[PDB]
Amino acid sequence: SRANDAPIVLLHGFTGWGREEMFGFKYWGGVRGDIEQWLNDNGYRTYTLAVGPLSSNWDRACEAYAQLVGGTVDYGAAHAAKHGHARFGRTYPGLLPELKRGGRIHIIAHSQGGQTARMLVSLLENGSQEEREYAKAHNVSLSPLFEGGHHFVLSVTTIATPHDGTTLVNMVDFTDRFFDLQKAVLEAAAVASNAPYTSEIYDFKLDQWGLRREPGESFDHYFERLKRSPVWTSTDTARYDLSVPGAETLNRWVKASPNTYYLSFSTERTYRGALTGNYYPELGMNAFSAIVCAPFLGSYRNAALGIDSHWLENDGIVNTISMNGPKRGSSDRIVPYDGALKKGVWNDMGTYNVDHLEIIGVDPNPSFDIRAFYLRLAEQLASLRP
Ligand SMILES: [Ca+2]
Ligand SMILES: [Zn+2]
Structure with missing residues (x-):
């Protein structure tokens, strides 16, 4: 039974858009339907955040904060x-x-x-010592986000998250293939990357960099500019945070709050090869991942980064080992779900035979009951003791 009435908030990854974007094709549900709607219809009040897909997690967190409580984003x-x-x-x-x-x-x-x-x-809990000290040094104003003390978040659930990064970023032609992935997702939503669209469609929300697609400029032409821009070349980027070194950097300061429940779901859509330790895409993995990304993920090793045979199982985008919770440079703990959810620790809820895009319905998978998956999850979150 229900132990709390806290609303659910949905939050996308390095692709994602608002419910009014992409002509209403939803990131959360994709070709399968509308997950936020399924939840609301079943009495689980639910909202969707939309932040910069390519921006740093810092930028996205500041955006999420202002998006939640109102006001002007302050980075x-x-x-x-x-x-x-x-x-x-x-x-x-x-x-x-x-x-x-x-x-x-x-x-x-x-x-x-x-x-x-x-x-x-x-x-929200601890703020930023760097921002606090800077503000005191220069006597400038300070966003409450950097002060600490907020108790906004009862739980965090991550699904197919690269807590320790993904080796996808280490591909030789990662830059071109990453933006080809963006185009594959567009295509999945019946949007072309070579059309000179004059209206908005997919806002990358790069206000801070002063970057924006021009009316009549195709997503092909736009992405070529983004590739050469600071949101691809700086360390203040989704690209850096997604990397194994960048993820660990994140992990060294972003810790689990003892006042918050953490759930993780892991994903795999691969098989192990015969005379090799390599992993290979299963029948049914979304085509872009199966052809472009999965072979690399299931075979790339890197001794300096500690990328060994345990990193090869993947979901087409992220190595499965990365998903149960932060471990690289992390003081966080992870425990297998044992029926009772515990605060301040990662509860590993299991691994699902579903690829990175299938789990959000952006790629079909008839054998995966996506409705039941999210309804069961909402129920678990509503049962959490405040
Ligand atoms: Ca599929
Ligand atoms: Zn930034």
Whole structure:
């Protein structure tokens, strides 16, 4: 039975868009339907966040915060000075004013969304010593996000998240293939990358970098510009955080809060080869991953990064070993789900035979009951003792 009434908040990874974007084709549900709607229809109040898909987890966390409580995104004076982009971003009305009145939320996060959710909790609870000290040094104002003390988040659930990074970023032509992946997802949503679209469709929300697709500019042409831009070449990027070294850097400061439940779901869609330790894409994996990404993930090793035979099982995008929780440079703990969910520790909820895009319904999989998956999850989150 239900032990809390906290609303659920959905949070995408390095692709993702708002419910009004992509002509209403939902990131959360894809070709299968509308997950937020399934949850709301079953009495589990649910919202969707949309943040910069290519931006750093820091930027995304500041965006999520302003998107949740309202106001103008503030990336911090220290951060903005360090990386050379605007301090202030777009303005939001505020999804959940109940939060500033003492409410809480469950965050369900897919892929890189799981890093963002963790970082948001870390900032909400502890703030940033670097931002606090900078503000005191320069006597500039400070966003409450950097002060600490917020109890907004009852739980965080990560699904197929690269807590320890993905070796996908180490591919020789990663840059071109990463943006081909963006185009494959567009295509899955019946949007072409070579059309000179004049209206919005997919906002990458790069306000801070002053970057935006021009009207009549195709996503092909736009992505070529993004490739050469600071959101691809700087350390303040999704690209860096997604890497094994970048993920560990994140892990060294983004820790589990003892006041928060953490759930993780892992994914695999591979088989192990015969005379090799390599892993290979299963029948049914989304075609782009099976052809472009999975062979590399299931065979790439790297001694300096500690990428060995345990890293080869994957879901087409992320190595499965990375998903149960942060471990590289992390003080967080992970325990197998044993029927009772515990605060302040990663509860490994199991591994599912579902690839990176199938789990959100963006690629079909008739044998996967995606409705039941998310309904069972919502039920578990509602049972959490406040
Ligand atoms: Ca499939
Ligand atoms: Zn930034």
